[PDB]
């Protein structure tokens, strides 16, 4: 037993990381089949980033201006194109380590693993949630752009995130692998409002179920509630409103533990109104919202991949 | 910027995981060169585990009784031997994916990444600390035995942990890769006292330095203290005593932030005596002790591997 914030095994993604250099700028790229994907701001100088015209900047580049290094191996760049905020560099070699993969646009509240990379080399792996305001709270130093976020389904890697930006507030923003930003953000060094974030209620409930499964049950209370009454409480505490779809997704955890979803909502209501009194749940002194219901079920059933 | 509990990239270890079956029991093994390492209790039935005589049980086994599956590939077992609490199965094929590696016995308070595995297949990766009482607080379901913990130094994997047991208290115990348990534990299904645990003081201090580097500085106080005065406080709160060796290890973080180690100790003293007042540090409402000074420096300098 036990419950940890667990990332997917990263080996299938490690074999796809490359270094991309354009002029003075080096960041990470993702090499799948004969295409390398990277943030288009690889073509910007530091001064360009204040107000870049990406079309004009890209027109000054040719295939031979993009240096792509796969460890020590090398890709000859035979074409380049811009798709939204990503650059797509066609190379003359298909990546022999290309896993089965899909490109996915995830929903706010969903989780994924990030492989943090510098100079095309993997540094570490950790699990994130896409915040309701479409930021992520990551660990990204200079040179980490182009690092990717992903999920695994047995043998298939679904890439969902590519890192582009740290906002002046220190949170992180990026795109799907078609180059569309999550949220209102742009790839420009300017002030950008993220807007109010909220707590992922269905994830908190899933984690309460995980706590009960592992024997942490002190928070189980005496009360029940209604969907509308609980949502009145959710709004006061900046929690996402709970819908019937969320209730349905929690169904299997409800059935395993014998705790009706609305009873768990009343326990969560009491935790929100009264705090945790210096107690902990699964080793945390805060309510955790970075595990989806699917995450909890997977960890409490031992699903494997490759 | 930002600070996350980050695991090492797991790909080099993924390529070493195999399934080991003996009779009814299947768990994980680690395939390096022409040797597969696994917990010796792979030879036990459920009833054996109550009081096993491993020497007598192993005498009833021959090479062909050990089924080792590397995905779909297979190792012919050509020899077997017991080294302390691990079984060493000699196979006729060297693992073509064997990384550069060492076997290391780590110290309490040190950290490592665990690749949780079932049936020889990787499930997830997370970062752990070896508690002062030589347990780890992991996520290990049935069938996870033989999963390993490791660190990476550029291209070299130092294996430090192999999972053997969940104690009746729900914490986890295991061996180094020579089969020697960390702590007083034995591979028998019986009640086993772990003994009092303590908080890893030098790790908490490292994480306070990481917090300051990332802009969380509200806890920085007005006071200083002495090593002996702080240790008086450490003992009251079940913290490990801080030594000069620990002070020396924190030297580089002290120098980067301009905060003398003893000043940070006085900030930690105030946090211990007054709590956190409903504030958070690096997103946590508890004092975190699972980052070593080396961990903090690595994450705030972007060291990479392969």
From Swiss-Prot, chains A, B:
Catalytic residues in the record: 41, 145
Boundaries of every Peptidase C30 domain copy: 1-306
Resulting phenotype, residue 90 to R: In strain: Beta/B.1.351
Outcome recorded upon mutating residue 142 to A: Does not affect ability to cleave and inactivate human TRMT1
Topological domain ranges for the Cytoplasmic compartment: 1-306
Covalent crosslink: Glycyl lysine isopeptide (Lys-Gly) (interchain with G-Cter in ubiquitin): 5, 90
Highest rank taxon of the organism: Viruses
Regulation of its function: Inhibited by pyridone-containing alpha-ketoamides compounds 13a and 13b. In turn, alpha-ketoamide 13b (tert-butyl (1-((S)-1-(((S)-4-(benzylamino)-3,4-dioxo-1-((S)-2-oxopyrrolidin-3-yl)butan-2-yl)amino)-3-cyclopropyl-1-oxopropan-2-yl)-2-oxo-1,2-dihydropyridin-3-yl)carbamate) inhibits SARS-CoV-2 replication in human lung cells. Inhibited ex vivo by michael acceptor inhibitor N3. Inhibited ex vivo by compound 11a and 11b.
Compartment list: Host cytoplasm; Host Golgi apparatus; Host nucleus
Catalytic activity: TSAVLQ-|-SGFRK-NH2 and SGVTFQ-|-GKFKK the two peptides corresponding to the two self-cleavage sites of the SARS 3C-like proteinase are the two most reactive peptide substrates. The enzyme exhibits a strong preference for substrates containing Gln at P1 position and Leu at P2 position
Stated role: Cleaves the C-terminus of replicase polyprotein at 11 sites. Recognizes substrates containing the core sequence [ILMVF]-Q-|-[SGACN]. Cleaves and inactivates human TRMT1, preventing tRNA guanine(26)-dimethylation of tRNAs. May cleave human NLRP1 in lung epithelial cells, thereby activating the NLRP1 inflammasome pathway. May cleave human GSDMD, triggering alternative GSDME-mediated epithelial cell death upon activation of the NLRP1 inflammasome, which may enhance the release interleukins 1B, 6, 16 and 18. Also able to bind an ADP-ribose-1''-phosphate (ADRP).
Self-association and partners: 3CL-PRO exists as monomer and homodimer. Only the homodimer shows catalytic activity. Interacts with host FBXO22; this interaction promotes the proteasomal degradation of nsp5.
Protein name (record): 3C-like proteinase nsp5
Gene that this polypeptide is encoded by: rep
Parent-protein start and end of this portion: 3264 to 3569 of 7096
């Amino acid at each position: 037993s036990g419950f940890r914030k667990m990332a997917f095994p990263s080996g299938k993604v490690e074999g796809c990381m490359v270094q991309v250099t354009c002029g003075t700028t080096t960041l990470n790229g993702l090499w799948l089949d004969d295409v390398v994907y990277c943030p288009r701001h690889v073509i910007c100088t530091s001064e360009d980033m204040l107000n870049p015209n990406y079309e004009d900047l890209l027109i000054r580049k040719s295939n031979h201006n993009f240096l792509v290094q796969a460890g020590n191996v090398q890709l000859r760049v035979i074409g380049h194109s811009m798709q939204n905020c990503v650059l797509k560099l066609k190379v003359d070699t298909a990546n022999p380590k290309t896993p089965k993969y899909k490109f996915v646009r995830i929903q706010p509240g969903q989780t994924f693993s990030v492989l943090a990379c510098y100079n095309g080399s993997p540094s570490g792996v950790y699990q994130c949630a896409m915040r309701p305001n479409f930021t992520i709270k990551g660990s990204f130093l200079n040179g980490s752009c182009g690092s990717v976020g992903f999920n695994i389904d047995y043998d298939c890697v679904s890439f969902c995130y590519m890192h582009h930006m740290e906002l002046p507030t220190g949170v992180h923003a990026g795109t799907d692998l078609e180059g569309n930003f999550y949220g209102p953000f742009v790839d420009r060094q300017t002030a950008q409002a993220a807007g109010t974030d909220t707590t992922i209620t269905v994830n908190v409930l899933a984690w309460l179920y995980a706590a009960v499964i592992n024997g942490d049950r002190w928070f189980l209370n005496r009360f029940t509630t209604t969907l509308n009454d609980f949502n009145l409480v959710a709004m006061k505490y900046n929690y996402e409103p709970l819908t019937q779809d969320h209730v349905d997704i929690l169904g299997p955890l409800s059935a395993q533990t014998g705790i009706a979803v609305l009873d768990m909502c009343a326990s969560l209501k009491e935790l929100l109104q009264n705090g945790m009194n210096g107690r902990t749940i699964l080793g945390s002194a805060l309510l955790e919202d970075e595990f989806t219901p699917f995450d909890v079920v997977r960890q409490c059933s031992g699903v494997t991949f490759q």
